[PDB]
Symmetry: C3
Subunit: 125 residues, 3 copies
């Protein structure tokens, strides 16, 4: 699965992305639907943005979990809530001290137009 | 909504993204469809790219607007058209003096696997 | 079409993205389905990520081809295979030598909510 994050760089230090990944990876693997050698978490920092009217110090974090097609809505609905909870908890200190917007979405890769070649599965398995 | 821009860094200065965001944010909100507190506009700069044949000084801007599921196709169509007119107008002096490709598409976020926590609503509302 | 890559920067020079793009652009064009003036290839470098367990020096390359809607699944399939064959070949040497994960998916743009303005078609034509 692909866990992609976009984060305004005004919160880059405090967001602690390494620490969220450190938690996210294992949490998804633990569900048993997702293989740990397949989990790929990364962030794209943003230096130029405009949230709302740009009149305050606004910060945002947008997250996408792209997964293989086939899991049931129910199974996705539940891994989502579970992961949203973890995310919420990771950013709680921040949400209480500054203006912050959190958004998380789950999408599926194309059922057949999907290609992969990954040698780390060998390490695990 | 999420207004996500990808821009080649050869026009990073002349493109004036901050200036585009200053006009897009208020035009989305005035449509009466998107709450100001929810608009997050951002650019991701690209330093390595190849357009066509890589034979000239090509520049490009790719824009995606991701919105919540549920607006009627006709709403979305008329909003995309009025936004595109503003965009073109914004880039008109560049379209005039150099090689530029503008592309814009509107995408819906998944209808139920969409999670959020935004405290800036409390400021507007 | 849009060929978007996300690359972990631990293989930033070894990956030779300019080299992959140099091959990718002409092979999309040689199909007769994708106009040269229209192919935009670019990479988003990632400086913060976690693959798997974060235990070793893992690298990952994720690629998305986004094309306008309406092509048969069968053409998309043959363009997908043909191009995964060339990606595999481009990184075969890194693969032999290190932990690496290659992923590639083909996605379509909305059939109608797509807007564009490109003055480079003029050079072609």
């Amino acid at each position: 699965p692909h866990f992609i994050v976009e984060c305004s760089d005004n919160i880059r230090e405090e967001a602690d992305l390494p620490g969220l990944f450190a938690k996210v990876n294992p949490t998804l693997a633990a569900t048993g639907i997702f293989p740990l050698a397949g989990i790929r978490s990364r962030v794209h920092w943003v230096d130029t943005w405009q949230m709302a009217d740009g009149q305050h110090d606004y910060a945002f974090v947008h997250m996408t979990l792209k997964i293989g097609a086939g899991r049931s809505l129910e199974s996705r609905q539940q891994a989502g809530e579970m992961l949203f909870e973890l995310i919420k908890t990771h950013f709680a200190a921040l949400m209480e001290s500054r203006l912050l917007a959190l958004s998380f979405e789950i999408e599926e890769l194309h059922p057949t137009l999907n290609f992969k070649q990954n040698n780390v599965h060998a390490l695990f398995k």
